[PDB]
Structure 1
């Protein structure tokens, strides 16, 4: 393991936290994938269902120069 986890009840909205250890005062762009709110860079998922459960990865790109930062998070949807 070592990957933090979010649990949410089915049909609820969720704001998925980006877990990349990012630098303050850097203006990242964000990408989100699935591996097969005042928190920056979170991914909003509305009306969650069971099929949404799985592992997600956010990646932050510096606008200047070729550098990025990635972190993972687990989602578990619990209800029918």
Structure 2
């Protein structure tokens, strides 16, 4: 709900986008998780996608000052065969 979706054919690579609303000119570090229960900054590369890669992912951008972070979610649906 309100979460964007990426569809990719199986065995293709995908660069999953970081949907955190980040600040320009801040040198973030990025950390990605899968929630179980390319010129775009901070994307997650997933090579040779398979059906099991489908799911909801969360990016978290950490401010270098260590006092702030920002997170956004994206859904991946793998649909080739």
Q: Quickly name the TM-score band, shorter chain normalised.
A: over 0.9
Aligned-residue offset at 1:78: 0.5
What root-mean-square deviation, in Å, do the aligned CA atoms of Structure 1 and Structure 2 show? 0.7
**How many Å separate the matches in 2 of 1:21 and 1:60?**
9
Instruction: Give structure 1 stretches of 5+ with no counterpart.
Output: none
**Could you state the TM-score of these two structures normalised by the residue count of structure 2?**
0.96
Aligned pair count?
80
**How many Å separate the matches in 2 of 1:7 and 1:70?**
21
Instruction: Give structure 2 stretches of 5+ with no counterpart.
Output: none
Q: Deviations over 1:33-65 (max 9, x none)?
A: 000000000000000000000000000000114
**How many Å separate the matches in 2 of 1:79 and 1:24?**
35
**How many Å separate the matches in 1 of 2:66 and 2:9?**
41
Aligned-residue offset at 1:79: 2.5
